[PDB]
Amino acid sequence: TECFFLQKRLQLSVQKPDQVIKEDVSELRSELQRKDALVQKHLTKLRHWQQVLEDINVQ
Amino acid sequence: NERLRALEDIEREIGAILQNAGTAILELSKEKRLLDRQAAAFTTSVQHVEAELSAQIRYLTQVATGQPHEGSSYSSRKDCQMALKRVDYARLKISDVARTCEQML
Protein backbone atom coordinates (compact mmCIF):
# COMPACT_ATOMS: atom_id res chain seq x y z
CA THR A 1 0.00 0.00 0.00
CA GLU A 2 2.85 2.39 0.79
CA CYS A 3 4.44 1.72 -2.60
CA PHE A 4 1.08 2.32 -4.27
CA PHE A 5 0.80 5.66 -2.49
CA LEU A 6 4.33 6.59 -3.58
CA GLN A 7 3.56 5.65 -7.19
CA LYS A 8 0.48 7.86 -7.00
CA ARG A 9 2.74 10.61 -5.66
CA LEU A 10 5.09 10.19 -8.64
CA GLN A 11 2.28 10.28 -11.19
CA LEU A 12 0.78 13.32 -9.46
CA SER A 13 4.09 15.20 -9.35
CA VAL A 14 4.75 14.51 -13.02
CA GLN A 15 1.12 15.37 -13.87
CA LYS A 16 0.46 18.33 -11.54
CA PRO A 17 3.34 20.07 -9.71
CA ASP A 18 1.05 22.97 -8.71
CA GLN A 19 -0.37 20.81 -5.92
CA VAL A 20 3.16 20.13 -4.66
CA ILE A 21 3.93 23.85 -4.78
CA LYS A 22 0.77 24.65 -2.80
CA GLU A 23 1.62 21.97 -0.24
CA ASP A 24 5.15 23.35 0.15
CA VAL A 25 3.75 26.86 0.61
CA SER A 26 1.32 25.60 3.26
CA GLU A 27 4.11 23.75 5.08
CA LEU A 28 6.28 26.88 5.04
CA ARG A 29 3.41 28.96 6.41
CA SER A 30 2.80 26.42 9.18
CA GLU A 31 6.50 26.38 10.06
CA LEU A 32 6.55 30.18 10.19
CA GLN A 33 3.51 30.23 12.48
CA ARG A 34 5.05 27.61 14.77
CA LYS A 35 8.34 29.53 14.93
CA ASP A 36 6.50 32.76 15.75
CA ALA A 37 4.53 31.01 18.50
CA LEU A 38 7.67 29.47 20.00
CA VAL A 39 9.43 32.85 19.91
CA GLN A 40 6.47 34.52 21.62
CA LYS A 41 6.41 31.86 24.34
CA HIS A 42 10.16 32.22 24.88
CA LEU A 43 9.80 36.01 25.10
CA THR A 44 6.99 35.69 27.65
CA LYS A 45 9.06 33.31 29.78
CA LEU A 46 12.12 35.57 29.52
CA ARG A 47 10.14 38.65 30.58
CA HIS A 48 8.64 36.74 33.51
CA TRP A 49 12.11 35.66 34.61
CA GLN A 50 13.41 39.22 34.19
CA GLN A 51 10.67 40.55 36.46
CA VAL A 52 11.39 37.73 38.92
CA LEU A 53 15.08 38.64 39.06
CA GLU A 54 14.28 42.35 39.39
CA ASP A 55 12.00 41.59 42.34
CA ILE A 56 14.42 39.12 43.94
CA ASN A 57 17.62 41.20 43.69
CA VAL A 58 16.36 43.68 46.31
CA GLN A 59 18.98 42.22 48.68
CA ASN B 1 23.54 44.87 72.66
CA GLU B 2 21.94 45.28 76.08
CA ARG B 3 25.08 46.87 77.55
CA LEU B 4 24.74 49.84 75.18
CA ARG B 5 21.15 50.49 76.26
CA ALA B 6 22.26 49.99 79.87
CA LEU B 7 24.97 52.65 79.57
CA GLU B 8 22.57 55.01 77.78
CA ASP B 9 19.98 54.59 80.54
CA ILE B 10 22.71 55.11 83.15
CA GLU B 11 23.74 58.39 81.52
CA ARG B 12 20.12 59.54 81.25
CA GLU B 13 19.60 58.63 84.91
CA ILE B 14 22.74 60.53 85.95
CA GLY B 15 21.45 63.59 84.12
CA ALA B 16 18.02 63.21 85.71
CA ILE B 17 19.64 62.81 89.14
CA LEU B 18 21.64 66.01 88.66
CA GLN B 19 18.47 67.83 87.58
CA ASN B 20 16.53 66.43 90.56
CA ALA B 21 19.28 67.44 92.99
CA GLY B 22 19.30 70.96 91.57
CA THR B 23 15.51 71.22 91.76
CA ALA B 24 15.45 69.86 95.32
CA ILE B 25 18.13 72.31 96.45
CA LEU B 26 16.18 75.14 94.81
CA GLU B 27 12.89 74.14 96.45
CA LEU B 28 14.53 73.67 99.85
CA SER B 29 16.43 76.97 99.77
CA LYS B 30 13.57 79.02 98.28
CA GLU B 31 11.45 79.23 101.44
CA LYS B 32 10.59 77.23 104.54
CA ARG B 33 7.04 70.75 101.86
CA LEU B 34 8.35 67.83 99.80
CA LEU B 35 11.94 69.10 99.96
CA ASP B 36 13.03 66.27 102.26
CA ARG B 37 11.62 63.55 100.01
CA GLN B 38 13.06 65.31 96.96
CA ALA B 39 16.55 65.46 98.48
CA ALA B 40 16.29 61.81 99.55
CA ALA B 41 15.28 60.76 96.03
CA PHE B 42 18.08 62.85 94.51
CA THR B 43 20.70 61.30 96.80
CA THR B 44 19.36 57.81 96.08
CA SER B 45 19.45 58.41 92.32
CA VAL B 46 22.99 59.80 92.52
CA GLN B 47 24.10 56.75 94.50
CA HIS B 48 22.41 54.45 91.98
CA VAL B 49 24.11 56.22 89.06
CA GLU B 50 27.47 55.92 90.82
CA ALA B 51 26.87 52.22 91.47
CA GLU B 52 25.89 51.63 87.84
CA LEU B 53 28.99 53.47 86.62
CA SER B 54 31.21 51.44 88.95
CA ALA B 55 29.60 48.18 87.81
CA GLN B 56 30.01 49.08 84.13
CA ILE B 57 33.65 50.02 84.74
CA ARG B 58 34.14 46.71 86.57
CA TYR B 59 33.39 44.71 83.44
CA LEU B 60 34.95 41.39 82.42
CA THR B 61 37.63 43.22 80.36
CA GLN B 62 37.27 40.91 77.37
CA VAL B 63 40.73 41.26 75.82
CA ALA B 64 42.62 44.47 76.67
CA THR B 65 45.65 42.93 74.93
CA GLY B 66 45.17 43.30 71.17
CA GLN B 67 42.65 43.99 68.43
CA PRO B 68 39.85 41.50 69.22
CA HIS B 69 37.21 39.90 67.00
CA GLU B 70 39.56 40.06 64.01
CA GLY B 71 37.76 39.19 60.79
CA SER B 72 34.30 40.57 59.99
CA SER B 73 33.15 37.76 57.68
CA TYR B 74 34.83 39.31 54.64
CA SER B 75 34.51 36.00 52.77
CA SER B 76 30.72 36.11 53.06
CA ARG B 77 30.73 39.76 51.95
CA LYS B 78 32.74 38.88 48.84
CA ASP B 79 30.50 35.88 48.13
CA CYS B 80 27.40 38.07 48.34
CA GLN B 81 29.04 40.64 46.06
CA MET B 82 29.81 37.96 43.49
CA ALA B 83 26.25 36.63 43.71
CA LEU B 84 24.87 40.12 43.11
CA LYS B 85 27.24 40.54 40.15
CA ARG B 86 26.08 37.21 38.73
CA VAL B 87 22.45 38.29 39.09
CA ASP B 88 23.21 41.59 37.36
CA TYR B 89 25.00 39.90 34.46
CA ALA B 90 22.12 37.44 34.09
CA ARG B 91 19.66 40.34 34.02
CA LEU B 92 21.71 42.14 31.36
CA LYS B 93 21.94 39.03 29.18
CA ILE B 94 18.21 38.39 29.61
CA SER B 95 17.44 41.97 28.59
CA ASP B 96 19.66 41.58 25.53
CA VAL B 97 17.88 38.35 24.56
CA ALA B 98 14.53 40.06 25.09
CA ARG B 99 15.56 42.96 22.84
CA THR B 100 16.67 40.46 20.19
CA CYS B 101 13.34 38.63 20.43
CA GLU B 102 11.40 41.89 20.19
CA GLN B 103 13.41 42.84 17.11
CA MET B 104 12.62 39.39 15.70
CA LEU B 105 8.84 39.56 16.18
DSSP-assigned letter for residue B86:
H
CA–CA dist B100, B103 (Å, integer): 5
Q: What ranges make up the beta strands (E) of chain A?
A: none
CA–CA dist B25, B89 (Å, integer): 70
B85 vs A contacts (CB less than 8 Å): none
CA–CA dist A28, A9 (Å, integer): 20
- Resolution in Å equals 4.0
* Residues with Cβ within 8 Å of residue B18, at least 6 apart in sequence: B46
**Which experiment gave this structure?**
cryo-EM
The answer to whether B95 faces chain A, any CB pair under 8 Å, is: yes
A36 vs B contacts (CB less than 8 Å): 105
Q: How far is CA B66 from the centre of its chain?
A: 23
* Residues with Cβ within 8 Å of residue B48, at least 6 apart in sequence: B13, B17
- Answer whether B69's CB lies under 8 Å from A10's CB: no
DSSP-assigned letter for residue A59:
-
CA–CA dist A20, A12 (Å, integer): 9
- Answer whether B28's CB lies under 8 Å from B39's CB: yes
What is the secondary structure of B37-77 as a DSSP string? HHHHHHHHHHHHHHHHHHHHHS-----SSS--S----HHHH
